[PDB]
Design a protein around this ligand. Structure first.
Ligand SMILES: CCCCCCCCCCCCCCCCCC(=O)O
Ligand SMILES: CCCCCCCCCCCCCCCCCC(=O)O
Ligand SMILES: CCCCCCCCCCCCCCCCCC(=O)O
Ligand SMILES: CCCCCCCCCCCCCC(=O)O
Ligand SMILES: CCCCCCCCCCCCCC(=O)O
Lengths: 45, 249, 292, 240, 292, 240, 292, 240, 45
């Protein structure tokens, strides 16, 4: 029985940390290329 | 499922042909876009001089030598006095634009070397100074180093990017290598990155454009000594608001 | 009712990537090992395609590496001495709010270029001997433009509009929630530009990198006193960054900082990696080989 | 008055307590959130980006030269090019990597690593290298015959200039402590040695010494645990 | 149930006016720029009708400029010294309740002519050295007509009907909710009249502007003591105006106040605007012009 | 006793805390609320009311004369009548305005402004003025040719005696800080200059110098943020 | 709703085994008394099958003998003296986290080989004279690898990522929940092995039994002070083991411990059972026999 | 502020208070729980495991010899082999048992006990023993005739080498205090005496003295109560 | 009316002790043998 993530103030920024939206999108840093290269393929053919 | 080595980049009346290209880095997977109505704050209608400013401007050619440290440009500053882009950048207070940075360095199959072409957002240039009082001039970089113009600026300490950050982690930025055995060009398409929808093209430089030789240019006697490095950049989706008298700096 | 929301409030475990079982590959045209680092893309080679792997149903929690969990930790952002003894009988101090004065918080923030966040500021105040006698303090936030106090009795302490916290040293640390206060969409730890137009030809060039979108005013602290108390109070400000939005990751700082508002490293550049004897020397002794 | 009893932990200030606090500004609406490119929400996404390993962290080697693994034409066979430990948080070549610096903000790590070696010689320079990962328990292999008994890749220089050596997650524990040295060599990851499988062959009038650039990163199954404070920069006085 | 009410308790963001996209206008009879300020009406000219505007979906929150948010902030309304040392061995003080003694609260209130509000009065009491020793105080509200105490032992402190707060200095600041106490519908910061009939021919004329509808009695504070304590206690009264209803907005005061209950400015009139060299001189240097 | 744990911020008195407090008067019903004309519920409604800009804030000019922009028959052409910065919270002509005084109770402002110029000459006095708003980055225009490159209105004196010049919200940031000067000229709004488009022509036996009254206000998209304490009146002693 | 969960939160009584009624057995082949202890199995003989038993509906609660109830009790795991007087003017102390320093907690833990548990660590700090003056302490958890503080002012106390608790001595004992922090699936009070490979031929052999999976870093405690306070603070650490999972029960330790991290008993071996005069002598006098 | 009133027990630290406390590590996911054999969830399960009673706890007897009950060929009849009290927590033979050590962590015990005697003589050694449990009130029986009036088992040595003597729960109270001695002999459990029912008969060339190993444990109805601190190991200084 | 076993923190290990799962399985220690021996039977026959 969990009783947390409760805001006691009318201002939304007084709430606790937003710790329920873990999203991992590494492609914008790891594969930031136009031509999607398959793993099994030689990249520069 | 592979990247074709041939590529043609047609923007405006400019066209760039490359036959040894690695790929095209789309910075952070985001194409340059015009400022949406939701993200805009300025009320004036922006000018979008599509083909007069969005085009490839070949700006600088730097001779790669064996002991060369590297060069860096600041994207708005490197075009602020060139073409119709510069005029719009001077006549308008506000500006936003992506770019298609295309670095060119061709060498024979008997040359070797590797450049690191990276586009660094908010490339704050550091000064290398001894322990001194905040009064000291050496603690802060002069304007020639913060805004090198179109000529660029030779790196003093490319190992720390002249920013106190290790060059080895500069690959966290949108980057591409020019490995002379592999490719002769590096293309980076960078969208407008800023905490603001528009910003002054004169005061604020959104991105740094570093070209650092990681593997030094080595060749044998008889090979062509002069191995140039050319920077051709093209604004993409350039907007300008706040028309007034043209301001240089 | 809304009891369903209170039920799904505990942090759920997001696990790491499972490893699939892989067999041997003997053929042509399939080269998952060969890459082209020039493309600026990291290698898409997987462990299954380079070695014969097993099936590992990975249950390691990746949830702690989030930007929220990495940043939602109160670190020291300011030490404000309320000098009221000796030559400095002020009883008050107006402190420029800057979170880049201490290395641990500064290096974590500079991992990102832009950060938009709310903060939980905590004030841990005490005397020099670590004791906390009941002594009324006033922590007034003086936003940019609000008049800064020039004494312990000045009119600005009336705080009719300024946020102010009255708390004795004996009380638990005052803690308040600060919103994202900035004219920009996000704070900017790196501002490649100048705040004003002009020539920027000064010998010092102090204005490079100074974005006023980050300058969020002053924290004016005073002892609520009528004369000198003879005691210096050390207010340690701790900022917990919550509701974090980070943009444009950057290399973590490698050189020792020298100043607060400028990247400025010594002429004696420290290598990111410690030196070893040779490129072929590793200091791992391992065990005794069976047959050398 | 509702009956309450204060429990231990009352009045304490835990620096890692995700709790509420009163807002200083009633009715404050911040500046609207516009889209900024390049948002990262996980530090593991940063650890998967390949960054240059400082494998030439030797005395005398300065600057960008510390990022190059020198490869040259060998007069003998089965020789050692370079070696480095694959402990991400150990003082060594992995300090120059984003994974090796984000690892230091955590106590325990887990998952496969990845070192992409890029050959930066002439197009005419050919060669084959044996890059071997030696799991723990063994020192650095003294011969290529001893190194090829571990996880290795025979890299052939060619049109594709880069090879990836995955350091597989070969560990007894689910996590390895980022701290190394002493009894914490229990968490040793291993040693990666680069051997000349064949020679570095070049035609005449071609450079005989080239460089391999190592690019270390983390695999998709990489995971960090127990956020701590790094030991990379020290401070003796408040930055003024 | 009533859980729907607790859900819609956070402040919703009311945004500013959006700007519509506008094009050029070339014609006659349509003059959105030409106005007639003589009519007493502000200009109805919009940005779209004077320049070519874009579509700006404005998301700036106007919610903070409300009269509630502007006034619901505890400001200093009174400093009451409970003198119990030296020549004044009283141990008590009867303070005339007036919110016009301090400039920051007074100027905000005088923005409006009539204000009807409840208040949250807070008492931040301490010694001269800012310390708060456990010392029992009695803050008794003495409404108009109730007998005022004449000593620290007098019978009025029995507070059988008067509201009274007993709190030590060591306690957190006593805070109470005061209703709208006034014979009138609203308080009146400006009363163009006299409280009594008569000739009003006195040389001083002290009764002009004095509306007893605002005179809400006294705050009698004492140390609950049997003799002199030798310590002077400074009680700072902070009023947070809530449930505000403001009427007839007024020009904000420009001259420095001189007295509490009267508008009275010096013969040296201070200009509302600071002087500049000439009507054609602006001190904004801007940038270097491209071609002068 | 219900188990509770006191958190930081306990016992603090935050002056901007909208919380409950015990009522001193049980069962108190206040005087009934009768309708009073002129209720204002938002300070932005007050900022949209046009108030006289003190454009003639010059040495020697005293009293109501500081509210007049003198306009006279010019012997030369393309001359400057008056100029003033449009920073609402800056010490200058906007101090005399309700918008410029309510701005000072806030840290950041946003939205378009509005200056309605009223010509108070004779009916027989004719003239055309160019009132130009110069966006930031430029100093005060030195010529009318330079000023007409910005947002401007050519005002023709006539039956309608007033013109409105909207200062459009031309800003890089969503909000501008009310504080100006120093590095806060980053938030400069611009400069409004009044130029003689044509001359100030009058028939004989007619006054040759008239006055323009500037009336500054805020547009409908005006917005304030971060309530603070103004710096307009200072106090050295409790008003007795 | 979830009110059914809050209803079944009290501990339910699990009773012991009932005794069934049994009669006399006169036959062959049925030998519930004869066992074979060589099989390694305990005797399955029941009371009903060896004596004539009655029906005992046993209602004795066996719930307290659970591993949770046996271990969920805060015992002393560490005494950390923050020396700040005399020759040791440190004002800080970095304490190696080990729960095997005190006999009562150590002997209970060593009942099991592997234990996986969360803990509730409590810090009961005071001066030598048992008094608790308001003195701000910082209890920072320094995980393995995090830099340990070398002074009371060092940068590590910025605790930007390290868990840290600020609490005065006057406050109730700081209490925090510590998760199962270990690279292994469970802690290991007995590790029959060596942490590193090698020869292990040292004269001391200090590394036998030392499993780094249990070494969970240090607890750095400091007085938040600017100079020496002249007072030594004794921090007593109490660990309450919750969410317990125990494996491989072991004999309870019989010899007195000699060191913290090693089983090492004296050459004077103490018998598990106290000596008596003879194998046929019991010291129970009972009552007076009716007829000897 | 919600009205609350602090009750007695405020600020106290009860070492046996199962309450919540703030987590030091936000978002910490521990190492996964793999299956480890031999999990015990109840200490009563441990008390039912038979462990060697140290019945020969006599002066001079050292080491493993203290675990043996010597049995030899008798020259007389109806003789006493060994005796021991069956108080589990009493200083004596039950200290060597797991039940006798877990009992000491509790104040009160209840339920039947169980002593399994294993004969460790030669296969050719035959004998019958009378193992009698004497309920409280009686001292150790002086004769086998007096001992056979209590709960007893006549054990015949043979192929099955072990006998079980259940000490039935014969008590006036539902629980017996683990503490013994003094007025706490009210909680005396009784005395178990081993008598020679017949002799210990062996053929020639066979050992004439053998050993009985006693294995004490707890029956299924065993129960402990009121967890306390044992008095088995004492400490005078923190183990360094 | 019981109001307990309530977690006030988003981390599940901050909860109170797990004191509602008393399980007794002594057979793994008392009868850890392959051949199940009946009580009435002679074990080694
Ligand atoms: C009552 C006391 C309230 C405390 C108010 C604290 C306000 C803090 C401002 C928010 C901090 C983040 C922005 C810091 C940016 C400055 C760093 C820099 O760029 O130099
Ligand atoms: C127990 C202590 C309770 C405190 C009682 C405070 C009562 C305050 C009265 C309400 C304040 C607003 C009315 C002030 C008007 C006087 C100003 C004036 O016109 O001179
Ligand atoms: C803010 C202060 C937080 C306190 C952190 C405490 C961390 C305790 C670690 C958990 C204790 C159990 C593991 C102990 C194992 C060591 C024993 C050993 O094998 O020598
Ligand atoms: C005061 C009562 C608050 C009730 C909050 C809801 C708790 C639901 C209990 C179940 C916990 C959620 C996870 C699960 O389904 O097991
Ligand atoms: C605040 C209200 C909490 C209610 C919690 C549920 C309590 C149910 C009452 C009955 C107690 C359970 C045992 C029973 O059925 O008798």
């Amino acid at each position: 029985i969990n009783f947390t993530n409760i805001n006691y103030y009318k201002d939304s920024y007084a709430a606790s940390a937003s710790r329920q939206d873990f999203a991992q999108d590494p492609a914008k840093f790891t594969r930031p290329v136009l031509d999607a290269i398959r793993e099994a393929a030689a990249p520069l053919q | 499922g592979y990247s074709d080595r041939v590529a043609q980049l047609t923007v405006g009346n400019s066209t760039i042909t490359t036959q040894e290209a690695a790929n095209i880095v789309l910075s952070y997977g985001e194409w340059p876009e015009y400022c949406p109505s939701t993200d805009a704050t300025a009320v004036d209608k922006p000018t979008r001089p599509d083909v007069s400013v969005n085009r490839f401007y070949t700006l600088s050619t730097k001779s790669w030598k064996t002991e060369s440290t590297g060069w860096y440009w600041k994207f708005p500053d490197v075009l602020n006095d060139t073409g119709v882009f510069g005029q719009n950048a001077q006549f308008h207070y506000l500006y936003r634009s992506g770019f298609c940075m295309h670095v060119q360095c061709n060498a024979s199959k008997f040359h070797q070397g590797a450049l690191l072409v990276a586009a660094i957002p908010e490339f704050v240039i550091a000064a290398s100074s001894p322990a001194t009082k905040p009064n000291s001039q050496g603690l802060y970089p002069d304007f020639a180093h913060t805004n090198p113009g179109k000529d660029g600026q030779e790196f003093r300490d490319p190992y720390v990017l002249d920013a106190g950050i290790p060059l080895s982690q500069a690959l966290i930025f949108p980057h591409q290598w020019i490995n002379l055995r592999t490719n002769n060009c590096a293309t980076i398409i960078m969208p407008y990155i800023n905490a603001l929808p528009f910003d002054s093209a004169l005061n604020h430089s959104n991105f740094g454009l570093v070209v650092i030789p990681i593997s030094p240019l080595k060749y044998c006697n008889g090979a062509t000594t002069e191995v140039p490095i050319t920077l051709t950049i093209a604004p993409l989706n350039s907007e300008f608001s706040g028309l007034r008298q043209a301001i240089k700096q | 009712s809304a009891v369903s929301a209170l039920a799904d409030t505990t942090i759920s475990r997001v696990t790491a990537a499972n490893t699939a079982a892989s067999t041997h590959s003997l053929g042509t045209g399939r080269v998952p090992a060969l890459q082209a680092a020039e493309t600026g893309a990291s290698s898409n080679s997987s462990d299954e395609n380079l070695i014969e792997t097993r099936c590992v149903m990975n249950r390691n929690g990746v949830n702690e590496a989030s930007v929220e969990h990495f940043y939602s930790r109160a670190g020291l952002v300011g030490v404000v001495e309320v000098k009221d003894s000796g030559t400095s009988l002020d009883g008050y101090t107006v402190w420029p709010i800057d979170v880049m004065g201490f290395v641990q918080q500064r290096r974590k923030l500079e991992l990102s270029t832009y950060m938009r966040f709310d903060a939980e500021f905590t004030f841990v105040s005490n005397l020099n001997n670590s004791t906390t006698p009941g002594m009324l303090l006033q922590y007034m936030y003086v936003p940019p433009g609000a008049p800064k106090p020039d004494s312990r009795k000045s009119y600005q302490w009336q705080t009719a509009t300024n946020p102010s916290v009255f708390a004795k040293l004996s009380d638990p640390p005052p803690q308040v929630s600060v919103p994202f206060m900035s004219p920009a969409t996000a704070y900017q730890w790196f501002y490649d530009g100048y705040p004003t137009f002009g020539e920027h030809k000064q010998a010092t060039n102090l204005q490079y990198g100074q974005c006023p979108n980050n300058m969020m005013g002053h924290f004016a602290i005073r002892t609520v006193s009528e004369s000198t108390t003879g005691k210096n109070i050390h207010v340690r400000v701790y900022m917990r960054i919550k509701h974090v939005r980070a943009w444009v990751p950057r290399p973590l700082r490698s050189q020792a900082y020298m100043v607060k508002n400028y990247p400025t490293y010594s002429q004696t550049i420290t290598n990111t990696a410690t030196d070893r004897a040779s490129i072929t020397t590793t200091d791992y002794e391992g065990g005794v080989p069976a047959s050398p | 008055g509702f009956p309450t009893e204060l429990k231990p932990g009352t009045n304490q200030f835990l620096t890692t307590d995700d709790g509420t606090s009163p807002p200083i500004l009633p009715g404050f609406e911040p500046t609207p959130l516009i889209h900024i490119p390049g948002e990262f929400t996980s530090l593991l996404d940063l650890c998967q980006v390949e960054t240059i390993l400082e494998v030439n962290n030797t005395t005398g080697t300065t600057g960008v030269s510390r990022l190059l693994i020198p490869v040259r034409a060998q007069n003998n066979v089965d020789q050692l090019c370079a070696s480095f430990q694959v402990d991400p948080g150990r003082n060594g070549p992995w300090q120059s990597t984003m994974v090796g610096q984000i690892c230091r903000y955590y106590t325990q790590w887990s998952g496969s690593l990845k070192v992409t070696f890029m050959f930066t010689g002439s197009f005419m320079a050919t060669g084959k290298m044996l890059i071997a990962y030696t799991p723990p328990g063994s020192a650095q292999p003294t011969t290529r015959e001893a190194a090829m008994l571990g996880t290795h890749i025979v890299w052939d220089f060619g049109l594709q200039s880069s090879v990836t050596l995955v350091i597989p997650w070969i560990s007894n524990t689910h996590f390895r402590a980022v701290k190394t040295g002493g009894v914490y060599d229990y968490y040793a990851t291993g040693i990666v040695t680069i051997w000349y499988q064949t020679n570095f062959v070049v035609p005449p009038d071609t450079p005989t010494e080239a460089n391999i650039i190592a690019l270390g990163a983390a695999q998709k199954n990489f995971t960090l645990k127990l956020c701590k404070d790094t030991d990379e920069i020290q401070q003796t006085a408040e930055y003024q």
